[PDB]
Amino acid sequence: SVLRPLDKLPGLNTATILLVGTEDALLQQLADSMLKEDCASELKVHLAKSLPLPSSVNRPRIDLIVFVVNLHSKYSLQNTEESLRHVDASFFLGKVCFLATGAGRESHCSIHRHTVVKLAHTYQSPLLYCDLEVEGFRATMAQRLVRVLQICAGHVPGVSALNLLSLLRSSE
Amino acid sequence: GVLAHLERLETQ
Amino acid sequence: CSEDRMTLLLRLRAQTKQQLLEYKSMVDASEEKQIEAKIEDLENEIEEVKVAFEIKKLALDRMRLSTALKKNLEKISRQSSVLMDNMKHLLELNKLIMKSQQESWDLEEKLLDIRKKRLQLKQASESKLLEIQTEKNKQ
Amino acid sequence: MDSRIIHENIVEKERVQRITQETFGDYPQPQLEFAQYKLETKFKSSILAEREEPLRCLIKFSSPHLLEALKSLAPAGIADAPLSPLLTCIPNKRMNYFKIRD
Amino acid sequence: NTEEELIRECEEMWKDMEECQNKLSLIGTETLTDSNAQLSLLIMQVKCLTAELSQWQKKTPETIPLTEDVLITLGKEEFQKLRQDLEMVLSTKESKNEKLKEDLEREQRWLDEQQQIMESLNVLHSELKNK
Amino acid sequence: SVIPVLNSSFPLEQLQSFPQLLQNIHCLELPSQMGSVLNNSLLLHYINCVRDEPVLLRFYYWLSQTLQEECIWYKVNNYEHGKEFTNFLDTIIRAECFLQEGFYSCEAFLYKSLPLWDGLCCRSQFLQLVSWIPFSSFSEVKPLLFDHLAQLFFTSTIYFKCSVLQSLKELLQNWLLWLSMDIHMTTLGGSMNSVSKLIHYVGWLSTTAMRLESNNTFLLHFILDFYEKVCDIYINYNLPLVVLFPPGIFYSALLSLDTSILNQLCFIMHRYRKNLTAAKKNELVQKNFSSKTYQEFNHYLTSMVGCLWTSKPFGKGIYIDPEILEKTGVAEYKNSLNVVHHPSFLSYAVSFLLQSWYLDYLFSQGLQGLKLFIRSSVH
Amino acid sequence: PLQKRLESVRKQSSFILTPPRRKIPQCSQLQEDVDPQKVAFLLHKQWTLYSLTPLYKFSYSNLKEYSRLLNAFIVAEKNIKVIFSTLLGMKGTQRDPEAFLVQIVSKSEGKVLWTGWFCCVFGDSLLETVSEDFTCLPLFLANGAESNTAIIGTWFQKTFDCYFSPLAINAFNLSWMAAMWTACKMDHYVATTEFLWSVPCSPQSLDISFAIHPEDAKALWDSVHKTPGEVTQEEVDLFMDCLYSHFHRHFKIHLSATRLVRVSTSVASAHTDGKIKILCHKYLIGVLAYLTELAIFQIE
């Protein structure tokens, strides 16, 4: 199956986010860090290991997809590269983000940062850096992701996902 | 300083 | 009671307008160095038209609010509201704000000249000591 | 517990948990610290297709407390749900050193 | 009241949204590869921007006049928030003034010391050049 | 200790008082390690004018190594440092406030550690270090700093936006101060290009942030404070340059409920008028300023006077036809935004109602900028 | 100016340009001016790596004074002697500075207790941005107790105004090094090829050792090598994927999710903490060049 952006009608003051990654503990920590703080909207978080998802009908529409890449293992990079081929092009227009983990400890890194630099640049998507092991940085990353999700869902008048694509565009 | 005041306001 | 429902209706209308606009744009769209120039031209055009529309809407809203407050100047005079405390607080705060602004203006005005004089003195001393050092080294 | 969070692939998690529980049991495992395997098997994967000689290898597993780290490999996502029989037969076959031929 | 008008507008917009989604649901999916991803995405961005510009050009400011009480309540809330905004601005301005005064004093002292050292060095230069 | 101790012509141990430095300024003994110089004012006075190459190389190497080793989130996960790093950064910032210039080690560290920054660990020290960046072409420095700064700017809270606006204001002030002394000694036109690009960049950032934050006056104060410094480039630094801020900021500030915002806007408009009338007379002597700026300023002034007391609010920007007001029910719109009926002056009107030629009362309340604008416009 | 050149070369190090490929190390006969006894002494020893900033005002003419000053300093800090010697033929090009050794000898000749080695091989990227008052020796190797190394480093920092930093090797560099050393041609094999992996199981601990006969590894590498005389990232990835698939086919463990730690082969052995051991004297220059490049990258 292929995931599409606009299959189902939006809910009433509800935003949904999807997190794809191999390490479940980090995803769980990021999720309950996002849900720890309150906001004006109703947030829902979905967790997955890879794409495509198991078939279901009750699943609502997805507004943002975040791919978590762990620099300490090539398995996560291979999994993300495989999963990137199961989403349509129309979903890449400002609704996909990349989150790299483990850049702080250089000695443990097994993947060069320049490889994920091409990976992010090829698909025209923003790239973020964070160490999910530390709570102080994880809280800030969760707040930033919540703000980005609120922008993407259309809760901010005058700003859409396409404009956000131009806002975070890199010069080179 | 200004930034110290901003920080001490942000904490509360 | 009705205020909460009215606010919710306004928020839902605002969100639904954006979502409908996005659907319409997607449907309309459904039907290498030379591409970036076109992209940035289009972005500038959208930015300009959005700014103009926002200014027009804000001006109309301010006009409506001003005429609404002017139409009921008497009712907001005798037994007006608890608003009087807020208005007196604003009146008290404004004078202090402007006084602090003037003080900051004067302080920055002095600091600019002091910094300029320091820079000129440093520039002169650099050349003077350089020539002294080169003369001493030559000797 | 945080009903707003939806865990997908939950059936896979419960299946791997059941498989691990059935294979490794629930009793406290005995304490071991070393295991050794010798392999004389052929390489099968275009690459070394014409080779008819075995690929000689020697593998050592070391840990302060073996038979417990291996139990936590499947839930951590490092290994597949059913482990290889060469790793789940240490106490049943009562061996520590293994030799494997083709 | 205006509540009925707002409800009717929301219902009409929801119906239009449903029709738009039904019309859009007849387009097939298109997946990308690592070789033809950048150019296709650029073309799609160009098309989407061209569509959005035309969509924005057609939009007009809607009047939809309301009553007077709602405007009064909105103004009251705006003033209430503006109160805290003003108090925060005042506190920041006070902190800025204090820091400016301290920096002014420090710069004055540094200028005095620099004048003294420059004068001494100039006198030493004159003395050495004389001999 | 992070800073090396002071260890050993004129002997170094005898240097203990200012007169001793005055007498033996020409000949001095350099320390074995330059780190001990970082916390000594007397040696700082000597280094203020040295410009010696091996000295700079040694200082750069030591500072870069110390900064790389002492970081918290780069190349090591070591939060045990805490306040030591803050104290060291404060010492470095205080040192570079002197010398009126910054080191290359700080620039290299900023280039290296900015992408991995989160925006909350050492915000004050980093944002103060940013202001002391050596002058260079905007195009070369944009991809290294400004891309990451803008990416971090759009996804944070309002306080981060205010802090980065303050830092950009300080950086602009430092750049203008350094460029002012150059003419007293790439040409002038090639250098004004960089500052024009920087001003346009910060204006775009301000407009986007103003749109995002649902028209918050707290950010508007910071934007107006920045443009106060922007407004007097030609007078304060004697550099030919006049740049006008976009109509979005003007029309957001004019239609605001705050009185201080209106006062600041009037002051900025008066400053633009003074700068333009001072530059126009010198333009004939130096003979080029684009006239389009003059027409834009004229349009802004026309709108301002029409909204203030001319009873002509429908200018080039507010192009609202009267049929909308007619169908809505607005009869008196000419003098609805005037001094009496402006929503910002509602409190003053209510206060004066309890007690006609009340402009003196408004001036006594502290409306100095409005008074200056009125005096400059009527006369 | 040299400062402008240094700033430009530092700011040019971005992650946009694709890293280049590396040439296969070629066995080369060493110059005849080197002492064979010293070369034999330098082999079969465990060295600890360090990166060193350029030395200020260092002269090769006065070595006795440096030795006597160091001896006085070490005596004051605490039957021993300190000797400075000059090595020959350890440079890559004619522009590289000469290497030298600092040795501590206990008299009783005496017994060597500590050895330091300063070297720079193919460091042309560093000599361009440095004035003539400095000497560039970015690579430092220490063999002995750590306490003596700390004292020597303190003395050097106090005297020549330098800086010592530990050097670490990550998994990427270890994989590249193993791939390159396997490709080198050997007449006789003395040691098997061994890899060490650390499985992240933080509540628990686990280590895996993978040993393989050198001839089978050579055949496997030749099966995937197609570019003549050059090493490409794709070839290294295929070489590692072969072992990953072979391990997974037997143990059902995704070995690519672990972290490589130690790599030993027939030419040298390396650890991720910055420990190197050299066995063959023919490929010394290549290893020294790689380590010098790593140190130069770290100090810039």
What's the CA gap between F197 and F191, in Å, rounded? 10
Q: Cα angle at G155 between G149 and G158, to 5 degrees?
A: 140
DSSP track, G237-295: HHHHHHHHHHHHHHH-B-GGGSEEEEEE-SSEEEETTTEEEE--SSSHHHHHHHHHHHH
The strand pairing partners of G277, in sequence order, are G46, G269
- Paired sense of beta strands G207-212 and D55-66, if any: antiparallel
Report the 10 Å Cβ neighbour count for A97: 21
Asked whether A79 and A22 are in contact (CB, 8 A), the reply is: yes
Strand partners, D56: D40
User: Which residue is associated with the tokens 């490589």?
Assistant: G260
Rounded to whole angstroms, the Cα distance separating G26 from G37 reads: 23
What angle is formed at CA A41 by the lines to CA A36 and CA A42, rounded to 5 degrees?
70
What 3-state DSSP class applies to A43? strand
Show Cβ contacts of residue A71 under 8 Å, excluding neighbours closer than 6 positions: A100, A101, A102, A103, A108, A109, A110, A111, A113, A116
Long-range Cβ pairs for the range C6-9 (8 Å, 24+): C6/E3, C6/E70, C9/E3, C9/E6, C9/E7, C9/E10
Helix (H, G, I), strand (E, B) or coil at A68: strand
Q: By the 8 A CB rule, do D34 and D67 touch?
A: no
For residue F171, give how far its alpha carbon lies from the nearest alpha carbon of chain G (Å).
20
Say whether the peptide bond before residue F240 is cis (omega within 30 degrees of 0): no
Three-class secondary structure of residue G144 per DSSP? strand
Interrupted after residues, chain D (C–N over 2.5 Å): 45
In terms of C-beta density within 10 A (0-12 exposed, 13-18 middle, 19 or more buried), how is residue D99 classed?
Answer: exposed
To test the contact with chain B by mutation, choose from E90, E95, E100 the residue with the greatest count of B C-beta atoms within 10 A, namely E95
Quick one: tokens of F271?
Answer: 């400053």
CB G128 within 8 A of CB G3: no
List the structure tokens of E106: 């420090």
Task: Give the three-class secondary structure for G198.
Answer: strand
Rounded Cα–Cα distance for residues C65 and D40 (Å): 88
Kindly give, in sequence order, each residue whose CB lies less than 8 Å from that of residue A41, ignoring residues fewer than 6 positions away: A13, A14, A15, A150, A153, A155
Q: Which CATH number is A14-168's, of 3.40.190.10, 3.40.50.12780, 3.40.50.300, 3.40.50.150? A: 3.40.50.300
- Of F107, F3, F114, nearest to F64 by C-alpha is F107
| Helices marked H in B1-12 | 2-11
Judged by DSSP in three states, G139 sits in: strand
Tell me the CA distances in angstroms from F248 to C56, F195, F317, G116, one per residue in order.
11, 21, 10, 67
Short-list E69, G264, A103, A3, CA closest to F77:
A103
A interface test, pick of D1, D3, D9 with most A CB neighbours within 10 Å: D9
One-letter amino acid for residue F297 of the chain:
F
Judge whether G211 and D58 are in contact, CB under 8 Å.
yes
Listed by start position, the domains of chain A span: 14-168
Query: 């072979």: which residue's tokens?
Result: G246
E4 touches chain C (CB under 8 A): no
CA F175 to chain centre: 10
Do the Cβ atoms of F2 and F70 come closer than 8 Å?
yes
Report d(CA G168, CA G140) in Å as an integer.
13
Which amino acid is present at E6?
A: L
Contacts of C33 (CB under 8 A, 6+ apart): none
Q: Taking CB atoms and an 8 Å cutoff, what residues of chain B touch E96? A: 2
CB atoms within 10 A of CB E3: 11
User: What's the CA angle centered on C123, arms C120 and C124, to 5 degrees?
Assistant: 90
Give the HSE-up count for residue F226: Cα atoms under 13 Å, Cβ half-sphere.
28
> How far is the C-alpha of A63 from the C-alpha of A11, rounded, in Å?
11
Do the chains contact at G10 and F144, CB–CB below 8 Å?
Answer: no
Which two structure tokens, joined as six digits, stand for F266? 């009037």
Distance CA A49, CA A44 (A): 17
Q: Please count the other Cβ atoms lying within 10 Å of the Cβ belonging to residue F130.
A: 20
Contacts of A81 (CB under 8 A, 6+ apart): A119
Q: Quick one: how far is CA G23 from the chain centroid?
A: 18
List phi, psi (to 5°) of G73: -65, -45
C96 CB burial (10 A radius; 0-12, 13-18, 19+): middle
Instruction: Kindly state whether C126 is in contact with chain A, defined as any CB-CB distance less than 8 angstroms.
Output: no
User: How many residues would you count in chain A?
Assistant: 172
Instruction: Please state, in angstroms and rounded to a whole number, the distance separating the CA atoms of residues G266 and G185.
Output: 10
From CA D11, how far away is CA A159, in angstroms rounded?
39
Residues in chain F that come right before a backbone break, where C and next N are over 2.5 Å apart:
8, 185, 287, 355
Q: Are F146 and A159 in contact (CB under 8 A)?
A: no
SS3 F250: helix
Picking from F118, F121, F148 by the largest number of A CB atoms within 10 A of its own CB, the best residue to mutate is F118
Q: How far apart are CA F18 and CA A51, in angstroms?
A: 72
A 43-102: CB under 8 A from E: 85-90, 92-93
Q: Around E78, how many Cα atoms within 13 Å sit in the side-chain half-sphere?
A: 17
Cβ contacts (< 8 Å) between G241 and chain A: which residues? none
Contact check, Cβ <8 Å, C132/E124: yes
Kind and range of the H or E run holding C49: helix C36-71
Which residue type occupies E116?
Q
Is residue F112 within 8 A of residue F74, CB to CB? The reply is: yes
Q: Amino acid identity, residue F23?
A: Q
SS3 A107: coil
Contacts with G26 (C-beta within 8 Å, 6 or more apart), sequence order = none
Q: How many residues does chain C have?
A: 139
E92 interfacial to chain B (CB closer than 8 Å): yes
φ/ψ (deg, to 5) at G155:
-65, -45
CA separation, residue A103 to residues A70, A80, F74, F146, F241 (Å): 9, 17, 8, 21, 44
- Please answer yes or no on whether C66 and F350 come within 8 Å at the CB atom: no
Tell me the C-alpha distance between G247 and G244, whole Å. Answer: 5
> Does A103 lie at the interface with G, CB-CB under 8 angstroms?
no
CA-based nearest residue to F193, from F135, F250, F119: F135
With tokens 């999910």, the residue in question is A132
Whether C17 and A157 lie within 8 Å, measured CB to CB: yes
Q: Which of G260, G179, G14, G198 is nearest to A111 (CA)?
A: G260
- Report the C-alpha gap between E48 and A96 in whole angstroms: 17
Pairing mode of beta strands G80-86, G207-212? unpaired
Distance from CA of C17 to the nearest CA of A (A): 9
Phi and psi torsions of C114, nearest 5°: -60, -45
Print the SS3 string covering chain E.
CHHHHHHHHHHHHHHHHHHHHHHHCCCCCCECCCCCCHHHHHHHHHHHHHHHHHHHHHCCCCCCCCCCHHHHHHHHHHHHHHHHHHHHHHHHHHHHHHHHHHHHHHHHHHHHHHHHHHHHHHHHHHHHHHC
Is residue G206 within 8 A of residue D69, CB to CB? The reply is yes
Listed residue (F265, F270, F262, F268) closest to F345, CA to CA: F262
**Under 8 Å between Cβ of D69 and G204:** yes
- How close G117 gets to chain D, by Cα (Å)? 35
Q: In the beta sheet, which residues pair with residue G140?
A: G50, G118
CB atoms inside a 10 Å sphere around CB E103: 16
> Which residues from chain C sit within 8 angstroms of residue E111, using beta carbons?
114, 117-118, 121
Q: In this complex, which of F75, F157, F212 lies closest to A156 when CB atoms are compared? A: F212
Binding-face residues of D in 2-21 toward A, CB within 8 A: 2, 4-9, 11-12
Containing H/E element for F299?
helix F291-305
Torsion angle of alpha carbons F38, F39, F42, F47, nearest 10°? 10
Contact A13 C43 (CB under 8 A): no
Q: Could you tell me the end-to-end alpha-carbon distance of chain B, in angstroms, rounded to an integer?
A: 17
- The set of long-range contacts for C28-37, using a CB threshold of 8 Å and a minimum separation of 24, is C28/E51, C28/E54, C28/E55, C29/E44, C29/E47, C29/E48, C29/E50, C29/E51, C29/E52, C30/E24, C30/E27, C32/E39, C32/E42, C35/E42, C35/E46
Sole residue written with tokens 């800073």? F3
Q: How far does the CA of residue F138 sit from the closest CA of chain A (Å)?
A: 13
Token pair recorded at residue F112: 């290296």
Which three-class secondary structure state does DSSP give residue G1?
coil
- Give which of G259, G211, G207 is closest to D63, Cα–Cα: G207
Encoded tokens for G100? 């030298």
Separation CA F177–CA G32 (nearest Å):
62
The alpha carbon of residue E65 is apart from the nearest alpha carbon of chain F, in Å, by 6
CB contact under 8 A, E91 and B5: yes
Residues F258, E65: C-beta atoms closer than 8 Å:
no
Measured CA to CA, the distance from residue G261 to residue G271 in angstroms comes to 6
| Rounded alpha-carbon distances, angstroms, from residue F164 to B10, C122, E25, F58, F125 | 15, 30, 45, 32, 12
Residue of B nearest to F127 (CA): B3
SS (H, E, C) F112-166: HHCCCCCCCCCHHHHHHHHHCCCCCCHHHHHHHHHHHHHHHHCCCCHHHHHHHHH
Element (H, E) at D5: strand D5-7
Resolution in A: 3.2
> What is the rounded CA–CA span in Å between residue E13 and residue E9?
6
Which stretch of DSSP H or E encloses residue A20?
Answer: strand A14-20
Chain F residues whose CB is inside 8 A of the G2 CB are 53, 57
F234/G154 Cα distance (integer angstroms): 55
Q: Are strands A127-130 and G268-271 parallel, antiparallel or unpaired?
A: unpaired
The experimental method, as deposited, was cryo-EM
Tell me how far apart the 2 most distant CA atoms of chain F are, in Å: 91
Residue G112 and residue G81 in contact, taking contact as beta carbons nearer than 8 Å: no
Please enumerate, as own/partner, the contacts of D89-96 that have beta carbons within 8 Å and a separation of 24 or more: D90/D32, D90/D35, D90/D66, D91/D29, D91/D30, D91/D67, D96/D32, D96/D34, D96/D35, D96/D36
Distance of CA E11 to the CA centre of its chain: 33
Please give the span between the terminal C-alpha atoms of chain F, in angstroms, as a whole number. Answer: 66
Q: Which two tokens stand for residue D91?
A: 């106490």
User: In three state form, how does the secondary structure of E11-38 look?
Assistant: HHHHHHHHHHHHHHCCCCCCECCCCCCH
DSSP secondary structure, F308-319, as one string: IIIS----SS--
Distance from the Cα of F336 to chain C's closest Cα (Å) equals 7
Is residue D88 a contact partner of residue D23, using CB atoms and an 8 Å limit?
yes
Interface of G with D in 252-291 (CB under 8 A): 252-254, 257-258
Q: Cβ contact (<8 Å) for A109 and G172? A: yes
- G184 Rama sector, left if φ>0, alpha if ψ -120 to 50, beta otherwise: beta
Give the pair of three-digit tokens for residue E30: 């298109």
Mutation site for G-interface testing, chosen from F6, F34, F57 by largest number of G Cβ within 10 Å: F57
Identity at F347, one-letter amino acid code: S
Contacts of D4 in chain A (CB under 8 A): 35, 43-45
Could you give the CA distance from residue E24 to residue C12 in angstroms, rounded to a whole number? 23
A42 within 8 A of A73, measured Cβ to Cβ: no
Q: How far apart are CA G140 and CA G119, in angstroms?
A: 6
Q: Are strands G100-106 and G207-212 parallel, antiparallel or unpaired?
A: unpaired
Closest Cα in chain D, distance from residue G274 (Å):
23
* CB within 8 Å of F117: residues ≥ 6 apart: F73, F126, F148, F152
Phi, psi of G35 (to 5 degrees): -80, 120
Gap between the Cα atoms of D83 and D66, Å rounded: 15
Question: Do F370 and F262 form a contact (C-beta atoms < 8 A)?
Answer: yes
Compute the distance between CA of residue F129 and CA of residue F85 in angstroms, rounded to an integer.
Answer: 14
Taking CA D20 as the corner, what is the angle to CA D14 and CA D23, rounded to the nearest 5 degrees?
Answer: 140
G118-129 per-residue burial string, b: 16 or more CB within 10 A, e: under 16: bbbbbbeebbeb
Contact flag for B and E (3+ C-beta pairs < 8 Å):
yes
G114: part of which helix (H) or strand (E)?
strand G111-119
Q: What is the DSSP string of G48-89?
A: EEEEEPPEES--SS--HHHHHHHHHHHHHH--EEEEEEE--S
